[PDB]
Amino acid sequence: MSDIFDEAASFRSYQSKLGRDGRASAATATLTTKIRIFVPATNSPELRWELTLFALDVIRSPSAAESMKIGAAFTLISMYSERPGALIRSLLNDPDIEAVIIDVGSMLNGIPVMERRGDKAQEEMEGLMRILKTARESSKGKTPFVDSRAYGLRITDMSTLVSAVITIEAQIWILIAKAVTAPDTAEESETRRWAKYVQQKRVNPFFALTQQWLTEMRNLLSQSLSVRKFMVEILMEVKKGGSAKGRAVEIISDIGNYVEETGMAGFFATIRFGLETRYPALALNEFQSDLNTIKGLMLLYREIGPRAPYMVLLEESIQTKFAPGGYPLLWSFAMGVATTIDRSMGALNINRGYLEPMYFRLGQKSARHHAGGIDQNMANKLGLNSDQVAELAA
Amino acid sequence: MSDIFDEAASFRSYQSKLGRDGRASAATATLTTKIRIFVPATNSPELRWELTLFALDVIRSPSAAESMKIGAAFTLISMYSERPGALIRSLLNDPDIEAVIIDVGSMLNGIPVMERRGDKAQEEMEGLMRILKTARESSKGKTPFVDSRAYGLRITDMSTLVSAVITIEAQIWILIAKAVTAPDTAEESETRRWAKYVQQKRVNPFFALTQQWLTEMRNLLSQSLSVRKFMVEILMEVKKGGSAKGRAVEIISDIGNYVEETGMAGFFATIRFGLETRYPALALNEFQSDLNTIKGLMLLYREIGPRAPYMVLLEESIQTKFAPGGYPLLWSFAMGVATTIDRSMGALNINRGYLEPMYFRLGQKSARHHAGGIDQNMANKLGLNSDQVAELAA
Amino acid sequence: TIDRSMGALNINRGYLEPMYFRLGQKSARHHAGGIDQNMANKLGLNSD
RNA sequence: UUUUUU
RNA sequence: UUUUUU
RNA sequence: UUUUUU
RNA sequence: UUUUUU
């Protein structure tokens, strides 16, 4: 009767937020891994330049352990800040890892431990020398930068160090946009971002890393989750306005503008196209369940919080519920109308197992052959029937 | 008159929740079985790696007693946590078994009891040696991992131990999805999940157990209920958000996303297809009783609590009332419209004794030949009669 | 007439009333489609 | 799970 | 009791 | 009194 | 990202 079909809606709403309530216990505590991070102790430009060169070499090194690579990545990311240790310690929310901040102090060819020399330090020094030697020998004499003069470059001016560091941060931060979604199909959007930032003169093109180093760093970023979590935390903190933003922070926020809502193109495309742009072909007895699921998904997305846009980057378990597969019909309709309407829509790889070609064809027809689609008109267009006819005439 | 046919609804509602009230007594207490669990006492990676290798061997062992197999499974599942004993003791709700947590301490080829050596310990040591020998001899020299180098591998780095342990937990947790529903028809969805997690780089494919070991572990999991109860409790605890989630916890929750609502495909398919997607062929004097039963089932499901989705895994007696057989007509209609609408729907084995082919045909016709199915339109589509005609034209 | 499983029940009682059994058998199939009060307005479902 | 543009 | 997809 | 399915 | 006028 009347009561049923509403009890169903309440049941689905309750099932969506079924057990996602309360607070968990500390028993489910992940084992922690020690990660050694080399941060610059002082503000001298030469020390910071040598440190970032060392971090580039370590990241490029093939014999480097994963923990050393994560340490080098953390050193690189926090290089712009005047207090990298404070930035790392105050913007770390990774239960998987524990970070031991190490102030570099002075600067040799590698790093001088300067803590009980001879006792448990010489082995670390030889290890760092081996890492550097393997990094330099692995490449065919090619420096990490696309320009050989950028590697063996002496930096003593603060402005030059700042420019080079900003360029390195920009080139690193380009990769996060398509690091886990489709790392193989990258180097096109990344090149577009690099060209955009070069044309804006925000980055000096002299310090441009080669594509081999970029591929290695992207592979490291995709393999590791702690680096992604740290960078997402940095993005969230920068997104919060209120204070003055520096050049590095502004570049990071501009990149995060592209980073947001990555890996969830299906859901947002479904929203924008199938749900909005109201077409008379919506209520047809095969889209009502999908509409209810979509509404529940919007409520869940609002409930998640500030980490919702970067759900794929943090690899949230909630992301699976957002993926198409629970609403294949409306999703297929929406991507059909998207591919017919948006030219850019159509390069997306959507050869899934629930394509529903009938509904894709229905959406394709609904986009063009359906009708002009005159929605409720606040202004009284009494004589616009001929206008609608002319618009549909194309 | 008017009063009757409502007294009937009240009678059925009261009959559904007939005697499910009050609190039971302690007289009906199941006999408890002692289960010995070997947990790592320390955090040294080599000890944990040797312990999980021992647990793999014990699970693969054919001469192992069932209690030893359950102990090995509990050791494996709680291996990721830094305090496996606390995790087991704080997440155990099995009245059938009692768990005696045993800290391993040091690590020999097997396990050193290190408690009154010679007195009631030598026999246990010989038993463990026999278990290991039988496990190694039973296989044709094949290690549990698909790679022979993964077995005799020395682990001293924490990161490598964490990666291997996470891979083992993932491969174990894949099996729970189809362990009791259709264990024989597995290895397809399990392989799909493994490929998904490999492509996401969450699991290192080097530590990939062979299919023989996976089949043995799945058989053990299906035979035993205590392991299933413990893993369901872990899933419920992880599902409760609020705290930071580690890599193991995130993988477990992502797997539990697929685990949820398993073994109850008939009921949920009936809901989604027959009840929702409102078709004019619903109220036909043979579906009203099924609708009332379905509403009562929704109320019961809401009343059950957080354990409702994993009813088949815990083998609840309430699950029988949810199974089709009490509403065969609406169920047949719903599966008919599902097989006509959803391409994936149709691989389900539904050759039951109450198929009602007439109603299945009626649902098949209702899906396509019935009508376009225009539901109540909030937007006034005065000119969409031709749109509906074109949509029905297909 | 409706439930296939219904029919294995032994109901050869002394008050079977064959006339009413036949009436029920006809009511199950030959009576009508049996459209009950429809909350949703199916104005065009006569052909359905 | 993911593969557009921005 | 259960045998899809996710 | 009872003889189905679940 | 941007390419008018004012």
PDB file of C-alpha atoms (C1' of nucleotides) in Angstrom, chain A residues 178 181 192-193 319 352, chain D:
ATOM      1  CA  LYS A 178      47.690  10.757 -12.105  1.00  0.00           C
ATOM      2  CA  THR A 181      44.586   6.470 -11.319  1.00  0.00           C
ATOM      3  CA  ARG A 192      50.535  20.237 -20.050  1.00  0.00           C
ATOM      4  CA  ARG A 193      50.813  21.311 -16.401  1.00  0.00           C
ATOM      5  CA  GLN A 319      35.704   4.526  -2.292  1.00  0.00           C
ATOM      6  CA  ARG A 352      33.614  -2.174 -17.903  1.00  0.00           C
TER       7      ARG A 352
ATOM      8  C1'   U D   1      39.514   0.047  -8.041  1.00  0.00           C
ATOM      9  C1'   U D   2      41.247   3.449 -11.941  1.00  0.00           C
ATOM     10  C1'   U D   3      42.219   5.361 -17.215  1.00  0.00           C
ATOM     11  C1'   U D   4      38.592  12.980 -20.104  1.00  0.00           C
ATOM     12  C1'   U D   5      39.082  17.996 -19.565  1.00  0.00           C
ATOM     13  C1'   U D   6      39.950  21.488 -15.856  1.00  0.00           C
TER      14        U D   6
END
